[PDB]
Design a protein around this ligand. Structure first.
Ligand code: HEM
Ligand SMILES: O=C(O)c1ccc(C2CCCCC2)cc1
Ligand SMILES: [Cl-]
Length: 393
């Protein structure tokens, strides 16, 4: 009944060009079995959306990586929010939601926008830049660690730590095992910055700790919640912004539409998140026997969701393989869906918006002018290097 495929979605070959294999996964059926890792897979929009929106059946507390926490030891203590189910999930979620709220966005927006404009001005002075190191990485590094309240020293640990986190959701292949064996100094740095004294007044970290007397979280929960933001909050945005620049670089017609109306900046970023899906995959674990897309899945089974595939499913999208900055994007699953839907999406969208706004106002053309190199990660899709010439408006 369920088709068995030998495709390895965590192989370098797959990362290098996932789109044909994603169609093969979609068209094989609503539910497939991946013999390579003994997991179920769903690659169509409908089943991905259904799985995300039934957290009781498709739980997160047994891990959202390949590893089943019921069978193996987690590589680090479980996240109090990502790797928790309701009801344990609910209060920590509410705290991060309030920390990363509308009001907070108002407090940081001017600074984020100023930093974006400044960066683009700087890059225009150079002309030929690497849109990954010099923009997609440099810009979030120039705003997010400060917004967290982190000291300057040690910040070089942040991207390596995130690379590790996202590789660790994968199977135990070379990417994952290499990441873990290099991890000790990055874990040590992160865990230390999560303590209250090390987080500057007014930043996200301090704000999490301040919530520890409302009864929503205890003081001993705050460091792990700071840890959540230091795991999730930087490398995601690097690859979201890199995706957007890469799209504008390949679709100059859409860059020209964006220039003509910079208020399209926020939807141009959202469309990039759909189109590239910086977060490609992650898992749920079944808590009972369940019927999904006409297939029966047993209890205690890992289910791999292909978010990127769902976001290109022609069953859901018209011209899914086109970058269209006026597309109606609502419903894409690039930020997830349901109770775990990205709690930092307002920060992500703010960064993406103000960067694309700066590009929209200051740059006339973005031309790739060197070899493009891809970065491999078990969960993240993005580039290592994107050489571009920026022409000033
Ligand atoms: C373009 C950037 C981003 C993308 C594409 C993205 C994507 C996602 C997705 C797909 C999920 C759902 C995971 C699941 O269902 O298991 C998620 C959750 C989460 N994200 Fe984001 N994210 C981004 C940026 C951020 C930022 C900037 C922050 C923090 C400042 C953040 C913090 C979190 C946290 C803490 C969760 C867990 C939420 C929960 O379990 O309730 N993310 N993100
Ligand atoms: O430590 C945490 O709580 C944590 C770590 C990583 C993430 C990722 C965000 C992007 C989608 C996949 C999960 C979310 C939360
Ligand atoms: Cl850690």
């Amino acid at each position: 009944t369920i088709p068995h495929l030998a495709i390895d979605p965590f192989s370098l070959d797959f990362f290098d060009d996932p789109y044909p294999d994603q169609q093969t996964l979609r068209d094989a059926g609503p539910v497939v079995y991946l013999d390579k890792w003994n997991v179920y897979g769903v690659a169509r929009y409908a089943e991905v959306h259904a799985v995300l929106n039934d957290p009781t059946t498709f739980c997160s507390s047994r891990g959202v990586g390949l590893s089943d926490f019921k069978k193996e030891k987690p590589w680090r203590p479980p996240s109090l929010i990502l790797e928790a189910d309701p009801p344990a999930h609910t209060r920590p979620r509410a705290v991060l939601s309030k920390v990363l709220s509308p009001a907070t966005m108002k407090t940081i927006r001017d600074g984020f926008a100023a930093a974006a404009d400044a960066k683009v001005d700087e890059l225009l002075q150079r002309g030929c830049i690497d849109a990954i190191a010099d923009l997609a990485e440099a810009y979030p590094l120039s705003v997010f660690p400060d917004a967290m309240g982190l000291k300057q020293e040690g910040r070089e640990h942040l991207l390596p730590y995130a690379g590790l986190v996202f590789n660790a959701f994968g199977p135990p292949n070379e990417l994952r095992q290499t990441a873990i064996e290099r991890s000790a100094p990055h874990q040590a740095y992160v865990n230390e910055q999560c303590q209250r004294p090390n987080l500057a007044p007014g930043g996200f970290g301090a704000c999490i700790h301040a919530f520890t007397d409302t009864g929503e979280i205890t003081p001993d929960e705050a460091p792990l919640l700071v840890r959540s933001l230091l795991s999730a909050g930087l490398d995601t945005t690097v690859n979201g912004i890199g995706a957007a620049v890469y799209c504008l670089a390949r679709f100059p017609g859409e860059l020209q539409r964006l220039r003509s109306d910079p208020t399209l900046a926020r939807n141009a970023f959202e469309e990039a998140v759909r189109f590239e899906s910086p977060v490609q995959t992650f898992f749920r674990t079944t808590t009972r026997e369940v019927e999904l897309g006409g297939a029966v899945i047993g209890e205690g089974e890992k289910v791999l969701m292909f978010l990127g595939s769902a976001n290109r499913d022609p069953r859901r999208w018209s011209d899914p393989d086109l970058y269209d900055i006026t597309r109606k994007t609502s419903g894409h699953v690039g930020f997830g869906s349901g109770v775990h839907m990205c709690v930092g999406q307002l920060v992500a969208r703010l960064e993406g918006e103000v960067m694309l706004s700066a590009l929209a106002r200051k740059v006339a053309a973005i031309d790739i002018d060197g070899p493009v190199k891809r970065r491999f990660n078990n969960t993240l899709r993005g580039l290592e290097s994107l050489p571009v010439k920026l022409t000033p408006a």
